[PDB]
Amino acid sequence: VRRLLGCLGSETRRLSLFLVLVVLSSLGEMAIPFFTGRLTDRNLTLMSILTIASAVLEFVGDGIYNNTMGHVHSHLQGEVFGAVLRQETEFFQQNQTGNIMSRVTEDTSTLSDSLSENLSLFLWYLVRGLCLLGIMLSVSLTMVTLITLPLLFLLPKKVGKWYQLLEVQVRESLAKSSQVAIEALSAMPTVRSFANEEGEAQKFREKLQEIKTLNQKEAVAYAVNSWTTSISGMLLKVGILYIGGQLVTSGAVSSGNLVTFVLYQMQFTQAVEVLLSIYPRVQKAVGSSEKIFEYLDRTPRCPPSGLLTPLHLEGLVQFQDVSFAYPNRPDVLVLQGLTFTLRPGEVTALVGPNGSGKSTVAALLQNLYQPTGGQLLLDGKPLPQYEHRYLHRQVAAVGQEPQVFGRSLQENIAYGLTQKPTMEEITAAAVKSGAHSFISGLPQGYDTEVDEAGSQLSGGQRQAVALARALIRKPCVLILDDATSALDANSQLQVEQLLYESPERYSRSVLLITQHLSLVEQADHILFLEGGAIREGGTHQQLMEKKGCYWAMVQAP
Amino acid sequence: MWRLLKLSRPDLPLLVAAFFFLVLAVLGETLIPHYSGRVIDILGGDFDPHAFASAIFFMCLFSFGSSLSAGCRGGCFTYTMSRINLRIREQLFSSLLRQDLGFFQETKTGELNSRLSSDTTLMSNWLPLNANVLLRSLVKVVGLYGFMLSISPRLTLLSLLHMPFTIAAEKVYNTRHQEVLREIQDAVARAGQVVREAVGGLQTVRSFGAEEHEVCRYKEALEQCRQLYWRRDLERALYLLVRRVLHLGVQMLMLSCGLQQMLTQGSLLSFMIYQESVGSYVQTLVYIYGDMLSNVGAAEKVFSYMDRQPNLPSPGTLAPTTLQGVVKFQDVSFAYPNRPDRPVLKGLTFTLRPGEVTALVGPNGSGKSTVAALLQNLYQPTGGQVLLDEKPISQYEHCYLHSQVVSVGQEPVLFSGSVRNNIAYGLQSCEDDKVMAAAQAAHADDFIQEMEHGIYTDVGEKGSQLAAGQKQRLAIARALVRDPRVLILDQATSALDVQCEQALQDWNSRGDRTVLVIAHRLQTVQRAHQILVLQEGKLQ
Numbered sequence A: 001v002r003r004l005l006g007c008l009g010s011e012t013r014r015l016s017l018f019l020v021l022v023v024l025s026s027l028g029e030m031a032i033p034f035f036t037g038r039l040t041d042r043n044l045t046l047m048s049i050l051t052i053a054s055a056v057l058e059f060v061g062d063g064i065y066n067n068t069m070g071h072v073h074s075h076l077q078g079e080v081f082g083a084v085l086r087q088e089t090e091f092f093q094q095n096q097t098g099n100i101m102s103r104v105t106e107d108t109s110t111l112s113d114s115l116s117e118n119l120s121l122f123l124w125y126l127v128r129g130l131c132l133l134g135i136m137l138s139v140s141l142t143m144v145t146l147i148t149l150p151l152l153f154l155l156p157k158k159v160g161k162w163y164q165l166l167e168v169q170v171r172e173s174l175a176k177s178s179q180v181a182i183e184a185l186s187a188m189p190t191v192r193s194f195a196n197e198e199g200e201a202q203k204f205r206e207k208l209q210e211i212k213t214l215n216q217k218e219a220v221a222y223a224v225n226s227w228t229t230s231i232s233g234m235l236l237k238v239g240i241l242y243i244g245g246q247l248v249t250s251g252a253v254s255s256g257n258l259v260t261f262v263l264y265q266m267q268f269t270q271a272v273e274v275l276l277s278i279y280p281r282v283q284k285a286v287g288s289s290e291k292i293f294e295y296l297d298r299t300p301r302c303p304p305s306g307l308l309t310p311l312h313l314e315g316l317v318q319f320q321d322v323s324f325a326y327p328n329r330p331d332v333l334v335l336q337g338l339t340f341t342l343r344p345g346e347v348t349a350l351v352g353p354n355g356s357g358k359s360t361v362a363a364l365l366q367n368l369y370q371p372t373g374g375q376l377l378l379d380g381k382p383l384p385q386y387e388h389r390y391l392h393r394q395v396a397a398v399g400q401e402p403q404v405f406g407r408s409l410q411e412n413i414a415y416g417l418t419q420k421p422t423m424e425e426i427t428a429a430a431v432k433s434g435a436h437s438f439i440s441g442l443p444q445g446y447d448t449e450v451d452e453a454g455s456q457l458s459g460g461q462r463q464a465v466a467l468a469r470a471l472i473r474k475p476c477v478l479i480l481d482d483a484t485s486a487l488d489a490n491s492q493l494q495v496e497q498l499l500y501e502s503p504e505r506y507s508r509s510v511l512l513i514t515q516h517l518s519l520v521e522q523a524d525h526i527l528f529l530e531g532g533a534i535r536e537g538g539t540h541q542q543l544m545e546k547k548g549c550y551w552a553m554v555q556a557p
Numbered sequence B: 001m002w003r004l005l006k007l008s009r010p011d012l013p014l015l016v017a018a019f020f021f022l023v024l025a026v027l028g029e030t031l032i033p034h035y036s037g038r039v040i041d042i043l044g045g046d047f048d049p050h051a052f053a054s055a056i057f058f059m060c061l062f063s064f065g066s067s068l069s070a071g072c073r074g075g076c077f078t079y080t081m082s083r084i085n086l087r088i089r090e091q092l093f094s095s096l097l098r099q100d101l102g103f104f105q106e107t108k109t110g111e112l113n114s115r116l117s118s119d120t121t122l123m124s125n126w127l128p129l130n131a132n133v134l135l136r137s138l139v140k141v142v143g144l145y146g147f148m149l150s151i152s153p154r155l156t157l158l159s160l161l162h163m164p165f166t167i168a169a170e171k172v173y174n175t176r177h178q179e180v181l182r183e184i185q186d187a188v189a190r191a192g193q194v195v196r197e198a199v200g201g202l203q204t205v206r207s208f209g210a211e212e213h214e215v216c217r218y219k220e221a222l223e224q225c226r227q228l229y230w231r232r233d234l235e236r237a238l239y240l241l242v243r244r245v246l247h248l249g250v251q252m253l254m255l256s257c258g259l260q261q262m263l264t265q266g267s268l269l270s271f272m273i274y275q276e277s278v279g280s281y282v283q284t285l286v287y288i289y290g291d292m293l294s295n296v297g298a299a300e301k302v303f304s305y306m307d308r309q310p311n312l313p314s315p316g317t318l319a320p321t322t323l324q325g326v327v328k329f330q331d332v333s334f335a336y337p338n339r340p341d342r343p344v345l346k347g348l349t350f351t352l353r354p355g356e357v358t359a360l361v362g363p364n365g366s367g368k369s370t371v372a373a374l375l376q377n378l379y380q381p382t383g384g385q386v387l388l389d390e391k392p393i394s395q396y397e398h399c400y401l402h403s404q405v406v407s408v409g410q411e412p413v414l415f416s417g418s419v420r421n422n423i424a425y426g427l428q429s430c431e432d433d434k435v436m437a438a439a440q441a442a443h444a445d446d447f448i449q450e451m452e453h454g455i456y457t458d459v460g461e462k463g464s465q466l467a468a469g470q471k472q473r474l475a476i477a478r479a480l481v482r483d484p485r486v487l488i489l490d491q492a493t494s495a496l497d498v499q500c501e502q503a504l505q506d507w508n509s510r511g512d513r514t515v516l517v518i519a520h521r522l523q524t525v526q527r528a529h530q531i532l533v534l535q536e537g538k539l540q
């Protein structure tokens, strides 16, 4: 409950100004009939001036409150998304995209809406009740009212936890439905290829049934709570009415001085009723914001970024007994005992069967995961010692199935660079990767917008754009992970000349992972990886005269 | 404006029950203050055995009945609007799946999810705040207009004077309000797409170290949304202030005309509070009716999506018990609907036979996957025709056709279910023996046993907890579990190693399957009976 009030602590000056305005307006509303502007003319123009001044103050208070609440909503929604992206990689395996999006975009909006609806009402009726308590001090009945008032707060405190326990579940159900929807909408050519629209509709209906089940309990609880707060207010009125009628006859307070207490009591009881009605909404708001506050309070398991930015860096990468276990499924080793060196000016190829662990090596080299039982060093220093942007500028990769974003071609090649590159550099990178042939033929050129996940491009064109995106950085450490799986015979010559004939190969160390064994013949080193272990190593010839697994793979037909 | 009532038609008994409880509630809270006054004016001497106790008991029972009816009305309204919101969500999601494939490229997935999440709740949350206020205001205006007995010409002057309550200003405010609500919803969808794209592609974002860029983009979108919200709030507050200022212009005129007539002084000051109350209540009624209309009209995008007809032909009715499997492209020319006037195919004509294997080769961007997608009836040709057993391929039933013509795509797409839920995808019933046979035929059963739970292992989202070759084998098994008649393989061995490539090379051991392979590398299509080489969309 303290987190909800602490999330609005960046606007303390504006809330204090609104509180001063509320106090002034309420004290004006409760001091009108005592004075009414005697003499000083005629009185109807004074009534007009009073109405105008009552309108202006309400306008100012509404403007201040609305501006403050908009700032609070935008700030909180920004901080939740900022906290989500700081987590580790495997955090995005337990949590799906639709669930995270429903947490970020919909739970925060609900929390902000509830907060903005309830805070001003609470402040208004609290100030109203606090003043009406003051002006009603028959003195003797006030302590009676104040000792019978905690009892009416006994029932909600035993109930409000229920209001949380429903709400969390409701939010979870909504997130699940969202994920289903997005998984149907990002793969429409596949779904229609198997005639499975009815299956997606049924999958949506399964979660909608759970939401429908929870809504009935919500409605029943709302009706029962309204009943209870109304009976509590009625009892609060009737008890003081009965004690006043009894005290009138037996001397004590005279009926003349007792009647004025009762008008004040009818308004104080209504203020107490409103304050009682607010509390279940506060418990519901605590229920609605459990996951986003868990995200905000979560600490990531990845090591933090370093502060090393050397001016000159070489592509000397060392593995020393590196093992990995993939913490989603621990106690099974994907890599056992890897130990190899990448030297600048050289190509090292990583060959092996399917599922052997080559993309795991590529992901370990990108500092996406930390090794379980070894050391991975870049120029004699660990990867977490370097700055995030510097390390991911120096080491670059393509990926097994490359991904592009929904923007123009010029900022897809230059995605992530802090200093924007010139159009001539983008043209040079596209010429180097072979993407210049089709981009120049497009009607808008490099400004051509591609859609979400690049549906307007074919596989080879997407691979060429990814290669150009990797090439624009001038990366000393280059990783290729099946980069020619969709390229034709004309576009493989560009990759071959990049690997073994470019002038820049002396400024790079290349790790090449392919199933096409024609590119492996000119590699400086070849490593055969089976079951996460390096079975063989050496050049092409030394692996051929020794027979073995590499010769078995090569002499397959 | 009338579709919403037709959609809310299955919620009629809850609505009429809520109205019954609402009129009971307003009757109770109307009748309470009279007996409260009877309770309080007994102060001139207390009566112990009677008078006081009867009055407080009657007030007790009146408040009890009013409270019970109010709680029942609130619960009924809450349940009704939850049901209506869920119905709108279900209908919109069912309508979205029928659209053509060009609809999903002009739109974005995060924006559609933002519509389905927020725009549906926008057209449901207003009634529990609006209906009770509007009905209470109407009841109080009707009751306060029942004070005709006081003075005769006052109501006749009132109706004519307060009839023009700034109609032009009301229309101006309603137009501006509807426009700003539409802009707010568009900005919210645009902000959601940023989170959509950043979270979905997190591995590439982390690999380039560009999370701060995505945070900055999201904060820019949030700033735009906040500016739109503040514009809406300032406009509403200014309109309310203008109304409250202009309310006095009739009150001072009536209070001057009473003095002008010199109905007495004791009766002239007997309805000023009544006049203020009835004016404020009719202003509130008009304002909340306008807010109702604007908030209903601001959600026209959801109505437009639910009444959108897809650009697809009439659905097929053919389902033969036997299919030969001969496929004919005749003079087929195609250009994509989202990017027209740039032809991809330029008069293709060929035949695919059941007993032969056909290879389709060409450079990048030549149009081979376009040929496959036209073969699977995913797009309609702009010229020529695609024939399956001498009939057009759009004349066959949707569920029948896609169990006979099956393809493995260029990039296989898996889902979040288990292994066997992906192998048996789209099938109403499938025994485990068929699933294991299809896994054996695709050489996938070797790595299935290595996973925990076997075929019940939770494949990750988009198949992200597997290798690429394992995903390829799962897609091949998913294609082969259907026992197809026409099988298309759009680079189906692009991730498998050498041994799995030479193991899966026949594709026609049955001898009665029309196979079309699409390949880039050679030395895998020597055994193809027919070879078709196409460059820039023209067969050579």
Ligand SMILES: Nc1ncnc2c1ncn2[C@@H]1O[C@H](COP(=O)(O)OP(=O)(O)OP(=O)(O)O)[C@@H](O)[C@H]1O
Pocket: A093, A326, A328, A329, A334, A353, A354, A355, A356, A357, A358, A359, A360, A361, A400, B464, B465, B466, B467, B468, B469, B470, B495
């Ligand atoms: N996110 C993940 N969580 C758990 N296990 C995973 C994950 N990604 C991969 N694996 C497993 O790790 C092992 C190695 O997979 P990896 O992607 O490294 O193979 P690979 O050698 O690149 O394969 P291929 O040649 O088919 O592309 C496999 O058994 C795979 O199922």
Ligand SMILES: Nc1ncnc2c1ncn2[C@@H]1O[C@H](COP(=O)(O)OP(=O)(O)OP(=O)(O)O)[C@@H](O)[C@H]1O
Pocket: A455, A456, A457, A458, A459, A460, A461, A486, B336, B338, B339, B344, B362, B363, B364, B365, B366, B367, B368, B369, B370, B371, B410
């Ligand atoms: N969804 C789409 N919308 C618009 N144009 C598209 C779309 N998909 C492909 N294209 C364009 O159509 C042409 C042919 O692409 P297609 O995918 O059919 O080629 P392909 O021969 O299968 O390619 P590859 O060998 O690279 O896989 C290209 O110019 C491509 O940019």
Ligand SMILES: [Mg+2]
Pocket: A358, A359, A400, B467, B468
């Ligand atoms: Mg791999």
Ligand SMILES: [Mg+2]
Pocket: A458, A459, B368, B369, B410
């Ligand atoms: Mg293709």
